[PDB]
């Protein structure tokens, strides 16, 4: 049908923005874990070398 004239375009751009979000959020959660695992490490190291 004619309304299918947008079926292959609106969904195509939605998939484009989906892969966008995949790039900008699968990397963002890496910013979440990277900024967190590297932040809980310093105090643990401090206590590790402060028992001695």
């Amino acid at each position: 049908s004619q309304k299918n004239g947008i079926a292959t375009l609106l969904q195509a751009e939605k998939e484009a923005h989906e892969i966008v979000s995949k790039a900008r959020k699968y990397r963002q959660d890496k910013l979440k874990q990277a900024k967190t695992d590297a932040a809980k490490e310093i105090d643990s190291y401090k206590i590790q070398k402060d028992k001695e």
């Binding site: 004619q2 299918n4 004239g5 947008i6 375009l9 751009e13």
Partner: peptide, 18 residues
């Protein structure tokens, strides 16, 4: 009627086939 991301225009019938 469908089927930046697309091109629109209008031409004379003399060259529609070519």
């Amino acid at each position: 009627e469908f089927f930046v991301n697309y091109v629109t225009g209008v031409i004379a019938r003399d060259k529609v086939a070519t």
